[PDB]
Amino acid sequence: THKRRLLALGPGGLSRERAGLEVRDVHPSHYGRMCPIETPEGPNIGLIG
DNA sequence: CGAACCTGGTCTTGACTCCATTGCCGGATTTGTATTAGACTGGCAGGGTTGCCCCGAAGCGGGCG
Numbered sequence: 001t002h003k004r005r006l007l008a009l010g011p012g013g014l015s016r017e018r019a020g021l022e023v024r025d026v027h028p029s030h031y032g033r034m035c036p037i038e039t040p041e042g043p044n045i046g047l048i049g
Numbered sequence: 050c051g052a053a054c055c056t057g058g059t060c061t062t063g064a065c066t067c068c069a070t071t072g073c074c075g076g077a078t079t080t081g082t083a084t085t086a087g088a089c090t091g092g093c094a095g096g097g098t099t100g101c102c103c104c105g106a107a108g109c110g111g112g113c114g
Contacts, residue, residue, distance in 0.1 A: 018099045 006034060008047040019047065 009015060024046035026036045034049045
């Protein structure tokens with residue numbers, strides 16, 4: 001699970017200081033394409049899936 | 050009762066040794082400067098991608114003198 005992991009913060013990706021809370025949220029196009037359960041639990045909720 | 054003894058510190062003499070310490074002294078290296086003569090004549094360059102708030106500044110529409 002450290003491979004096959006989707007990340008959302010990099011060069012050209014969204015930094016935490018510019019992170020919008022809309023991108024944190026799941027929405028029903030993740031069904032089958034991402035997992036709403038598994039994500040980091042600290043301040044990086046929803047960015048890393 | 051008095052006379053020597055050997056030995057502690059306490060100190061002195063003088064000779065010996067040994068090593069710092071400059072002083073050259075000659076050479077090695079190293080730091081800075083100058084000089085290249087055909088002709089050359091205006092840059093690459095991504096972080097920006099928030100949200101909110103306060104505020105300063107431009108700019109134009111609005112009445113105005």
